PDB file of C-alpha atoms and ligand atoms in Angstrom:
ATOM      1  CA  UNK P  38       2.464  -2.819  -1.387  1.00 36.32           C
ATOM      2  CA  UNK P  39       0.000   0.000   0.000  1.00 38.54           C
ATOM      3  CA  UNK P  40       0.906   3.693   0.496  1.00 40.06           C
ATOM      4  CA  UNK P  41       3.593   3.633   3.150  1.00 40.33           C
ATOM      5  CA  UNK P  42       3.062   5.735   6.108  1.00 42.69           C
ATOM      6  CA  UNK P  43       4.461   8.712   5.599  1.00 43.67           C
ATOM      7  CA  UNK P  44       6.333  11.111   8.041  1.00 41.67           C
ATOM      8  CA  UNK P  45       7.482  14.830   7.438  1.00 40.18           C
ATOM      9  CA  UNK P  46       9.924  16.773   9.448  1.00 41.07           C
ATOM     10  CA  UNK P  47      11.292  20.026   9.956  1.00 42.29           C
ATOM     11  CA  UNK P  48      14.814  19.796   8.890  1.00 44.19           C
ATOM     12  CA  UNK P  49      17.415  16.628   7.606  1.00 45.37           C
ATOM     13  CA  UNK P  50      19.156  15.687  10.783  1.00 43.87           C
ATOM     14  CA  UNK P  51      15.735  14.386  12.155  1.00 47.24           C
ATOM     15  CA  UNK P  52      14.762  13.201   8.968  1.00 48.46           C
ATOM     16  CA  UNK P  53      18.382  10.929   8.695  1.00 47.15           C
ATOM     17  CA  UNK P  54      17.525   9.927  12.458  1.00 44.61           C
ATOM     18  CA  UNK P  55      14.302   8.737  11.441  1.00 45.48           C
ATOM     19  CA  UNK P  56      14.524   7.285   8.207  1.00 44.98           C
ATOM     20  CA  UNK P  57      17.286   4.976  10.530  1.00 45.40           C
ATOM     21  CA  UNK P  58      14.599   3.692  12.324  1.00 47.41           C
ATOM     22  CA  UNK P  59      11.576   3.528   9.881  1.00 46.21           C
ATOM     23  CA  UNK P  60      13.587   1.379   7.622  1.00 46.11           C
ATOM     24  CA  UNK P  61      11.717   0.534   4.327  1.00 49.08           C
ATOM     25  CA  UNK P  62       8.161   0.999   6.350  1.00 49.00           C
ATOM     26  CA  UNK P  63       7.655   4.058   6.197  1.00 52.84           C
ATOM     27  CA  UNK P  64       9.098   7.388   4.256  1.00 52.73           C
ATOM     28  CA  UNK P  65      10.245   9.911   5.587  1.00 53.29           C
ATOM     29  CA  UNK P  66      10.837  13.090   3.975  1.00 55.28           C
ATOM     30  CA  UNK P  67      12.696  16.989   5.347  1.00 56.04           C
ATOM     31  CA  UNK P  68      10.639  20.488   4.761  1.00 57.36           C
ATOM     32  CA  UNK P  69      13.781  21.851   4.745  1.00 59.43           C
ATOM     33  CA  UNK P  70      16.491  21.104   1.962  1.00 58.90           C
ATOM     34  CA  UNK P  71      20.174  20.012   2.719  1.00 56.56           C
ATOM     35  CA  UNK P  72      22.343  23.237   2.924  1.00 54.87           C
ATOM     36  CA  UNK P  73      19.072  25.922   4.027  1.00 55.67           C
ATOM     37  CA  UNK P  74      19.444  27.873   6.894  1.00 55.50           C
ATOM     38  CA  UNK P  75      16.913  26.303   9.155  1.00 54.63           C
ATOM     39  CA  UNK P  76      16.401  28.622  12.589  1.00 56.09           C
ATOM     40  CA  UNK P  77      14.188  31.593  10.360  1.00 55.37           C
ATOM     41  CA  UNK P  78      13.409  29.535   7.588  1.00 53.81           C
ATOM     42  CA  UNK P  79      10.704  30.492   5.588  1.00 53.79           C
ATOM     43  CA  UNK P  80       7.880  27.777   4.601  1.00 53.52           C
ATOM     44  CA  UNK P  81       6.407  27.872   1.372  1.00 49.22           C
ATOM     45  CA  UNK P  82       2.990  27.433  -0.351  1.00 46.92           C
ATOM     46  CA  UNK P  83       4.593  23.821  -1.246  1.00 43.88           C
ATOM     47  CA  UNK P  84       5.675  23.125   2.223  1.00 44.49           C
ATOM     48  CA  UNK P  85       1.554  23.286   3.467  1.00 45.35           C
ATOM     49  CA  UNK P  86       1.125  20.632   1.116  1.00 41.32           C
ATOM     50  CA  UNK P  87       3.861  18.037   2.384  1.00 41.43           C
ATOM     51  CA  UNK P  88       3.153  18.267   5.920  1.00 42.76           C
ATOM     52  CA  UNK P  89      -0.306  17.994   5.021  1.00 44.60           C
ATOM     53  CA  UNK P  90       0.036  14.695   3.528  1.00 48.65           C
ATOM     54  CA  UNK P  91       2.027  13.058   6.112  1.00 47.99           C
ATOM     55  CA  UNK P  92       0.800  10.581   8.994  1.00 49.23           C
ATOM     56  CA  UNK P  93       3.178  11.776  11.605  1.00 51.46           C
ATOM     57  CA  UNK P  94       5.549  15.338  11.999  1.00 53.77           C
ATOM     58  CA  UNK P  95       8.416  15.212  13.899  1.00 52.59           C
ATOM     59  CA  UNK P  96       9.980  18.834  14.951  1.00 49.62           C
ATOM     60  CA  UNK P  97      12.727  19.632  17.588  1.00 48.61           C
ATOM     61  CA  UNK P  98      11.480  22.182  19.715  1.00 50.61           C
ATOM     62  CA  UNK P  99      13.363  24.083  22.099  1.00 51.52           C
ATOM     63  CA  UNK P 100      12.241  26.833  19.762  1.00 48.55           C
ATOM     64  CA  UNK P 101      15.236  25.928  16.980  1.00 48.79           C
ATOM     65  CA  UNK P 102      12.051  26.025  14.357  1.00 49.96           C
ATOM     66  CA  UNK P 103      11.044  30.129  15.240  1.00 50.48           C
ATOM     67  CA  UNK P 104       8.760  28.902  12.227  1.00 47.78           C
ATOM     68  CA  UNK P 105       7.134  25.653  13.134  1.00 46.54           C
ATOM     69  CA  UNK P 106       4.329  27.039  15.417  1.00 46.40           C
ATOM     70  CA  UNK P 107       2.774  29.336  13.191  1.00 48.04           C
ATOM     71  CA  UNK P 108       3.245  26.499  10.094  1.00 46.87           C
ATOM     72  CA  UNK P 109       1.578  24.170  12.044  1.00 44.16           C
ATOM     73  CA  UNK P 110      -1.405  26.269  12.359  1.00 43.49           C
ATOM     74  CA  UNK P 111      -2.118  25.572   8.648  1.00 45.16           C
ATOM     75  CA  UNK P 112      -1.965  21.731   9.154  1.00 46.00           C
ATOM     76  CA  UNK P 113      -5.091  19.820  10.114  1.00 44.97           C
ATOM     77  CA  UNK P 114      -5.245  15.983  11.966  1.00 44.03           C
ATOM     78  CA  UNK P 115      -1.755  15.296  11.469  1.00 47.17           C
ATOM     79  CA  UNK P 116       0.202  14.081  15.226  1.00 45.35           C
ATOM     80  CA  UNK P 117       3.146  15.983  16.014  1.00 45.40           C
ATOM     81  CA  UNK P 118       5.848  15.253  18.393  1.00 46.41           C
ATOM     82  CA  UNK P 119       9.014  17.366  19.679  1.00 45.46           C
ATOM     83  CA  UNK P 120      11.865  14.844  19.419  1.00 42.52           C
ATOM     84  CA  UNK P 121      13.491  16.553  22.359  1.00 40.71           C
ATOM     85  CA  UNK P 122      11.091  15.517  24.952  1.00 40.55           C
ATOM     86  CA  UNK P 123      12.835  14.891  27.915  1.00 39.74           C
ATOM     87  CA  UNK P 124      16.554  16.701  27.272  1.00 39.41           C
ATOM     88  CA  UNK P 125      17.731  19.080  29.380  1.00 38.52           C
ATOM     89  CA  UNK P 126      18.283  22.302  27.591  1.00 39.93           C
ATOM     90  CA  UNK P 127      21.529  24.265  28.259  1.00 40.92           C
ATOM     91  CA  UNK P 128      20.263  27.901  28.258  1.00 37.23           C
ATOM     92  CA  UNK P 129      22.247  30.374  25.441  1.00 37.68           C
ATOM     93  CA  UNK P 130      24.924  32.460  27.542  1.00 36.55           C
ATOM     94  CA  UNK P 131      24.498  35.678  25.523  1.00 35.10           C
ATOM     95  CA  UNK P 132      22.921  37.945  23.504  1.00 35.69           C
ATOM     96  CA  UNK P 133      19.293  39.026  22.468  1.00 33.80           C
ATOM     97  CA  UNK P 134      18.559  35.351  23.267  1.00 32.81           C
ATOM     98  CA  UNK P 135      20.166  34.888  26.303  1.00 30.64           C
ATOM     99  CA  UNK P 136      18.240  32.377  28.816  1.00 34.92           C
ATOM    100  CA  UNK P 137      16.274  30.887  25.898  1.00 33.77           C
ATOM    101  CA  UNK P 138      17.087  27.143  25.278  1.00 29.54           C
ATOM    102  CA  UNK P 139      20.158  26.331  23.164  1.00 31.97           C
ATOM    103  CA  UNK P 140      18.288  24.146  20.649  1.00 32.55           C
ATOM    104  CA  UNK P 141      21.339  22.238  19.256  1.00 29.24           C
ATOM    105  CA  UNK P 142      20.659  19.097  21.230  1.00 29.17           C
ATOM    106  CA  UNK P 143      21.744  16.434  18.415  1.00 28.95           C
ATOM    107  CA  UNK P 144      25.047  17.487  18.590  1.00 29.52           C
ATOM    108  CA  UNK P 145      25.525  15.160  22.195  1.00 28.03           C
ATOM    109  CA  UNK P 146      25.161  11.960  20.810  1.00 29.06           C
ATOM    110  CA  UNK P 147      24.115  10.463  24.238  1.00 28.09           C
ATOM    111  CA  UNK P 148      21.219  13.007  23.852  1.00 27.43           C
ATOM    112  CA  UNK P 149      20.137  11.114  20.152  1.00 25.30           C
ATOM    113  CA  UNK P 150      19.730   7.974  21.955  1.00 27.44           C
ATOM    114  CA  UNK P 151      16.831  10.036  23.394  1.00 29.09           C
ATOM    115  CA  UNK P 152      15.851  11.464  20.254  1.00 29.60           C
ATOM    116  CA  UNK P 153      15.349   7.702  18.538  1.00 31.33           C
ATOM    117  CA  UNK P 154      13.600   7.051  21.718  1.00 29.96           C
ATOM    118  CA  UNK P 155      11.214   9.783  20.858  1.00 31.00           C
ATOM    119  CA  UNK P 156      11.014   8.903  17.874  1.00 31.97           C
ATOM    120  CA  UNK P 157      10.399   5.476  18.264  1.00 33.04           C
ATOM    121  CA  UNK P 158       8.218   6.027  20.606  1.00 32.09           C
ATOM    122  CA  UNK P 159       5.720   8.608  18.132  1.00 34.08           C
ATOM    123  CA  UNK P 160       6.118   5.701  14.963  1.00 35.24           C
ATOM    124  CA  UNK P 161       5.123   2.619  17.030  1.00 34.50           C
ATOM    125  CA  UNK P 162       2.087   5.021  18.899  1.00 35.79           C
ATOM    126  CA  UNK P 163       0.888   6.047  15.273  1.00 36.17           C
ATOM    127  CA  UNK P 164       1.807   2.721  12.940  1.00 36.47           C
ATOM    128  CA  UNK P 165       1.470  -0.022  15.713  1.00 35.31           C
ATOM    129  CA  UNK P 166       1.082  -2.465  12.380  1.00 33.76           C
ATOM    130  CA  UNK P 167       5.100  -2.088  12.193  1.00 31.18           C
ATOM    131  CA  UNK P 168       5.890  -2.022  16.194  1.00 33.65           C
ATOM    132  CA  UNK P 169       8.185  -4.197  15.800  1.00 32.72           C
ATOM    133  CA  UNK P 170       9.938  -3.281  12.292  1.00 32.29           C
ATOM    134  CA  UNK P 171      10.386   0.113  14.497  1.00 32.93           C
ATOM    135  CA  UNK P 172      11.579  -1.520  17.721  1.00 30.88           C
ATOM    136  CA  UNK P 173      14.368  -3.649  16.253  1.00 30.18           C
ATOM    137  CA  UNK P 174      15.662  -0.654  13.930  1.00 28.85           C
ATOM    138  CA  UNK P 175      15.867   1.644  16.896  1.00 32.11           C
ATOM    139  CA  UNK P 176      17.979  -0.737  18.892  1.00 30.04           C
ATOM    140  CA  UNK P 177      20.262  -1.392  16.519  1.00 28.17           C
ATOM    141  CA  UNK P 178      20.520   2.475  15.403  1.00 24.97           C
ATOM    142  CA  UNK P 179      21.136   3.034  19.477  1.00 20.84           C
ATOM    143  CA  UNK P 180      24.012   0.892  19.213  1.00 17.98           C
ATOM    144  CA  UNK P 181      25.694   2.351  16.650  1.00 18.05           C
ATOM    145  CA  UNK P 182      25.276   6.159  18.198  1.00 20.25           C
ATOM    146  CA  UNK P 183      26.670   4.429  21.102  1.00 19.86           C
ATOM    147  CA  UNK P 184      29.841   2.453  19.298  1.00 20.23           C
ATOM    148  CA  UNK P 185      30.899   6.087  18.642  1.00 21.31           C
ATOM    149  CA  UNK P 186      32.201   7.590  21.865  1.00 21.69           C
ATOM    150  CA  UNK P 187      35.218   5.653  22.095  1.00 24.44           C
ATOM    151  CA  UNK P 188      36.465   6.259  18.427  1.00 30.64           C
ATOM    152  CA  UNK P 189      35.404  10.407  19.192  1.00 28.34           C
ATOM    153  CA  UNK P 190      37.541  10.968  22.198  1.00 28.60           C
ATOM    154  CA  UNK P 191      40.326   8.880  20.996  1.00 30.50           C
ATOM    155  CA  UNK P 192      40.558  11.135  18.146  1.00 26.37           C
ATOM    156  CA  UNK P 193      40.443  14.370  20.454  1.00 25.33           C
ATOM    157  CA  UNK P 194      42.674  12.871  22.833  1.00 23.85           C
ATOM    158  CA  UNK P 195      45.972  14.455  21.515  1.00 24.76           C
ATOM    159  CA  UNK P 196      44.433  18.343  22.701  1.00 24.58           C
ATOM    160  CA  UNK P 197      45.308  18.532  26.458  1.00 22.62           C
ATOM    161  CA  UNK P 198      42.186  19.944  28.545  1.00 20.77           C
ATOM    162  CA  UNK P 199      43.511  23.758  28.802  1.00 24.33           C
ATOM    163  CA  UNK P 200      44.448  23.642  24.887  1.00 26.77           C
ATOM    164  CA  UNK P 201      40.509  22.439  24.209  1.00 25.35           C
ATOM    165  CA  UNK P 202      39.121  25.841  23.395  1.00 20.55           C
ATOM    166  CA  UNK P 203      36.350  25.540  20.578  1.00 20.67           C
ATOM    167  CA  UNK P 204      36.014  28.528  18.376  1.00 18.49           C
ATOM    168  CA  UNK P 205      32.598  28.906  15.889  1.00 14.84           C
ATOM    169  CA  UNK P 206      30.665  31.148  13.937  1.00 15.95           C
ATOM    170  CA  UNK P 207      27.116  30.359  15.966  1.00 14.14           C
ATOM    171  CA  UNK P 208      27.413  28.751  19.188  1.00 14.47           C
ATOM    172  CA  UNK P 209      25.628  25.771  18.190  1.00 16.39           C
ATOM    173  CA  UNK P 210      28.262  22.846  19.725  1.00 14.02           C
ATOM    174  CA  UNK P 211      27.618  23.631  23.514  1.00 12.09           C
ATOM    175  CA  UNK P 212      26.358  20.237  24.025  1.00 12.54           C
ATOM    176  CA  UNK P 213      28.794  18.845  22.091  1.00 15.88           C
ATOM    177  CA  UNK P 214      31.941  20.510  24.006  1.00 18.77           C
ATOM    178  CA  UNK P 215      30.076  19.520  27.320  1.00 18.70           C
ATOM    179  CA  UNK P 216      30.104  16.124  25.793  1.00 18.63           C
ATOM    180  CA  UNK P 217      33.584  16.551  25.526  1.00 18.04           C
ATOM    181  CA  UNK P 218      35.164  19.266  27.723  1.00 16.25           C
ATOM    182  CA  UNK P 219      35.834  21.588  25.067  1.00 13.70           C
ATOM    183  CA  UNK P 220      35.322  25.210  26.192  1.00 14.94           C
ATOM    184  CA  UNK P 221      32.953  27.227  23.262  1.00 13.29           C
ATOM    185  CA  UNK P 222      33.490  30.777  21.787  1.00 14.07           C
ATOM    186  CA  UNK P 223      31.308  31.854  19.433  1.00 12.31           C
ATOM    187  CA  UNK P 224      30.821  34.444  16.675  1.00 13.36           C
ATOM    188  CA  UNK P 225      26.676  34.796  17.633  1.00 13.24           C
ATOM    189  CA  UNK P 226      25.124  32.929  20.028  1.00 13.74           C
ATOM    190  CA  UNK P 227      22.334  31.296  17.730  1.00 12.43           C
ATOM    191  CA  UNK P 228      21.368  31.955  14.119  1.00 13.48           C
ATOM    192  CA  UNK P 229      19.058  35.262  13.853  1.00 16.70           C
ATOM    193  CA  UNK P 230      18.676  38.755  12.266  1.00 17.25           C
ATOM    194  CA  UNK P 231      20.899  40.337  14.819  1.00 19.53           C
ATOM    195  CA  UNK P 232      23.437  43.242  16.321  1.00 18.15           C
ATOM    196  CA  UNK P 233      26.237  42.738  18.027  1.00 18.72           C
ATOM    197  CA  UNK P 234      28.604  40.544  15.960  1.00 22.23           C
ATOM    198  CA  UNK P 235      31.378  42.840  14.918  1.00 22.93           C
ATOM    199  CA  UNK P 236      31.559  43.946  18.506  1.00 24.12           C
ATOM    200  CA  UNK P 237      31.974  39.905  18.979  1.00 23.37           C
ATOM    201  CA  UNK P 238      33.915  39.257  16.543  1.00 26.89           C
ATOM    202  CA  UNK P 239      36.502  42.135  18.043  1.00 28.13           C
ATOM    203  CA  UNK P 240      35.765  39.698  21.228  1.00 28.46           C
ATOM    204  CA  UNK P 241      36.646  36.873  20.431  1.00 32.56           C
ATOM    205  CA  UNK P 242      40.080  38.194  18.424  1.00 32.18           C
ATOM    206  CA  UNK P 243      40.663  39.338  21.883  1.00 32.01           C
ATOM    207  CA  UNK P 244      40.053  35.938  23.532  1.00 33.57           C
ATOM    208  CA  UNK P 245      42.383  33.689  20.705  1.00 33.21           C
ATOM    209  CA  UNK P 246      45.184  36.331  21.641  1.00 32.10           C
ATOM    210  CA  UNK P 247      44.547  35.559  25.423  1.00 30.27           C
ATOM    211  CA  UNK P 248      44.654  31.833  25.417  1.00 32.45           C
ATOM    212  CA  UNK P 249      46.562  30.910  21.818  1.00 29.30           C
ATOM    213  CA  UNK P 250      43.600  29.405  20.029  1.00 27.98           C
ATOM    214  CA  UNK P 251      45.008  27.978  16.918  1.00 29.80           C
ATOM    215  CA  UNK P 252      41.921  27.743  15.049  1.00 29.86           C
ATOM    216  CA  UNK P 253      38.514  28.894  13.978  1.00 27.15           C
ATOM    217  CA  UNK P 254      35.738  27.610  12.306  1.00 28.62           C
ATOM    218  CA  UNK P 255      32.449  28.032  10.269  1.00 28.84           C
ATOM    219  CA  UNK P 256      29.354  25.948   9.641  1.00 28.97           C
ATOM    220  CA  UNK P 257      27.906  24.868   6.686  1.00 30.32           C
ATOM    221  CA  UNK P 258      24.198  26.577   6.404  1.00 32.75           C
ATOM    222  CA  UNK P 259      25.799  29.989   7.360  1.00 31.74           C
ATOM    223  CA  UNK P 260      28.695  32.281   6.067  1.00 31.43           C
ATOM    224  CA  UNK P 261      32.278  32.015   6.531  1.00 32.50           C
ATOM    225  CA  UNK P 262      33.199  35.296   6.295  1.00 27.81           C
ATOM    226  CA  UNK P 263      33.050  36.605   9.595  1.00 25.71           C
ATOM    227  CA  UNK P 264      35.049  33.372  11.125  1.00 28.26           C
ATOM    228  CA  UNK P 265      38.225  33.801   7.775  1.00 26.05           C
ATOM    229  CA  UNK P 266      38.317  37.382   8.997  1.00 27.54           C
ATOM    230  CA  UNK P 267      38.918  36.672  12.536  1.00 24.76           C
ATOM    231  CA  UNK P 268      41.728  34.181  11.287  1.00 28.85           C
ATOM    232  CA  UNK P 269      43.126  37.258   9.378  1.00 33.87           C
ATOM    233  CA  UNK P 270      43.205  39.349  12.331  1.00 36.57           C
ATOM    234  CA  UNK P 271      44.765  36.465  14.179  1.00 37.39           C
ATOM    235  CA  UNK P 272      47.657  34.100  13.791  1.00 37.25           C
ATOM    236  CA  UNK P 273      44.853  31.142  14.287  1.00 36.99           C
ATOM    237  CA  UNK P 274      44.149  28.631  11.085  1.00 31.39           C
ATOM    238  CA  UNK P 275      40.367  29.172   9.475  1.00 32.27           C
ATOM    239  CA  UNK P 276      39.094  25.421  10.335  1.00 31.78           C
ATOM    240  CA  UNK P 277      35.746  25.206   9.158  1.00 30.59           C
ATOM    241  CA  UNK P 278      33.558  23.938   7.753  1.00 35.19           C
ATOM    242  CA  UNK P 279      31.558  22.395  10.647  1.00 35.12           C
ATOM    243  CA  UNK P 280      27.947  20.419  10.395  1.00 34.59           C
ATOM    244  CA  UNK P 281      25.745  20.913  12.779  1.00 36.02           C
ATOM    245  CA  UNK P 282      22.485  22.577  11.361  1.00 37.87           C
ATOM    246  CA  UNK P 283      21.684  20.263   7.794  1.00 37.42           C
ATOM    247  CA  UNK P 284      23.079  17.509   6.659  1.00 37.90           C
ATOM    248  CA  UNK P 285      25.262  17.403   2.814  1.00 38.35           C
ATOM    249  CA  UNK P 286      23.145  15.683  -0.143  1.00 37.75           C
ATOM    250  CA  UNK P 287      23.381  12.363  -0.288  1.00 39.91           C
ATOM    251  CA  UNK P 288      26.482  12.112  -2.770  1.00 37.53           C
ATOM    252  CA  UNK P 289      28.303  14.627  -0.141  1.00 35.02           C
ATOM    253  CA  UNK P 290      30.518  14.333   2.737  1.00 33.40           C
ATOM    254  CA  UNK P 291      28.080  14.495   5.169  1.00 33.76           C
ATOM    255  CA  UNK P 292      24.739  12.509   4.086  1.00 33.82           C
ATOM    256  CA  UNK P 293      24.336  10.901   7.067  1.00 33.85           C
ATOM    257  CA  UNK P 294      23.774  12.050  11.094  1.00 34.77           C
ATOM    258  CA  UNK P 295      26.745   9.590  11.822  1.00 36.36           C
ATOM    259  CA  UNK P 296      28.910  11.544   9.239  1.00 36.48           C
ATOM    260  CA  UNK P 297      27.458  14.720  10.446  1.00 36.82           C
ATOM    261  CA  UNK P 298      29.355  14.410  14.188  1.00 38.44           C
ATOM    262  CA  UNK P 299      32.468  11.913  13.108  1.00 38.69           C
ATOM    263  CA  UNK P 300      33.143  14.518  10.296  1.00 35.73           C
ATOM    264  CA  UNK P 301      32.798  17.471  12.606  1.00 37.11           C
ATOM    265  CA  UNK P 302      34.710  15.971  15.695  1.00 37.18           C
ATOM    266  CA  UNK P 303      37.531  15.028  12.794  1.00 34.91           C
ATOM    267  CA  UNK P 304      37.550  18.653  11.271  1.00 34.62           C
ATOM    268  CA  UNK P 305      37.840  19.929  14.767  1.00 36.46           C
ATOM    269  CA  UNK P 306      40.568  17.470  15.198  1.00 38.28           C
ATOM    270  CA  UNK P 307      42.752  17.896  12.900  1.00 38.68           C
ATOM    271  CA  UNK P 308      42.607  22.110  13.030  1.00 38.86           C
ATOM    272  CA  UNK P 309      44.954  21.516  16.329  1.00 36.60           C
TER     273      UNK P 309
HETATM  274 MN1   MN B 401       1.210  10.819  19.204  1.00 32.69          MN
HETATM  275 MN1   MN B 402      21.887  26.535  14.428  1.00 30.42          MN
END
């Protein structure tokens, strides 16, 4: 065979998680497109009609969609769930959106064992004819998120704790350099229409002097100008690019959520 249950969700790192667990049961399709900025993303005409026609939409809350709620409004009897349910947010440190939840959760990947969780948890609720298609997938999808925290800090292991200073355009890796006792400096504290950046990029110039950071880095949905500048201004290398917000197509480096963090702990890696 029939139709196959369909799901829809906001952006591709949910959709890659999902897909994972869904297997050949269901298809699962991304609103937005690998590479698009996704915080103030703006849904289309077209985008009405895919949610529309899915069984099940999966978003991540903590307010990383500013667009989801109003979108939603224009969607009628399909389920929704927040794939975050149950993380604890670390709050944004600075800026216009200081004390708001940092919404890069994914990037901890003891925190995706919770999103497949969720997400198990929403396709075996709303296609119980494939409970156990969905079941076995998301235990063996745990297992490989979990097979990946020795390989990750034996490749950071060379950068003694003080040196461990991680330098980005948005600060979207705090959970990741918790995960990892990296300390974060960013460019902006979360993608948005904002002030304040040259006044943090002179900021953080100040703070690589301070501490010799050797390098800086960008992210692949967002511009790399401001991070080659404050390598210019610097001795530090420029790094980047970093994935953290989309995924790369599916011929790039980065097609998959497991590529998406080895390729950005291995980036950071080899910058020191
Ligand atoms: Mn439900
Ligand atoms: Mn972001």
């Amino acid at each position: 065979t029939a139709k196959k249950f369909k799901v829809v969700t906001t952006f591709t790192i949910i959709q890659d998680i999902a897909q994972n667990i869904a297997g050949d049961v269901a298809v699962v399709e991304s609103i937005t497109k690998p590479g698009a900025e996704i915080h103030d993303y703006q849904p289309t005409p077209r985008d009405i009609v895919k949610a529309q026609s899915a069984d099940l939409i999966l978003w991540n809350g903590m307010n990383l969609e500013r667009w989801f709620e109003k979108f939603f409004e224009s969607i009628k009897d399909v389920p929704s769930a927040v794939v975050t349910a149950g993380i604890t947010p670390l709050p944004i440190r600075e800026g216009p959106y200081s004390g708001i939840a940092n919404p890069h959760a994914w990037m901890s990947p003891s925190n995706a064992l919770i999103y497949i969780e969720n997400i198990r948890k929403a396709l075996v609720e709303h296609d119980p004819a494939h409970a156990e298609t969905y079941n076995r997938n998301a235990q063996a999808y745990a297992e490989k998120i979990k097979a990946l925290d020795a390989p990750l800090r034996e490749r950071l292991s060379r950068i003694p704790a003080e040196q461990r200073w991680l330098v980005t355009s948005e600060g979207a890796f705090s959970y990741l350099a918790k995960d990892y006792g990296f300390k974060e400096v960013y460019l902006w504290p979360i993608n948005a229409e904002q002030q304040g950046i040259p006044q943090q990029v002179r900021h953080v110039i100040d703070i690589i002097r301070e501490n010799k950071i050797p390098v800086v880095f960008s992210e692949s949905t967002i511009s790399d100008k401001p991070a080659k500048q404050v390598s210019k201004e610097t001795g530090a290398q420029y790094g980047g690019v970093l994935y953290v917000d989309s995924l790369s197509g599916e011929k790039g480096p980065v097609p998959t959520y497991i590529s998406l963090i080895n390729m950005t702990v291995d980036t950071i890696a080899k910058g020191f």
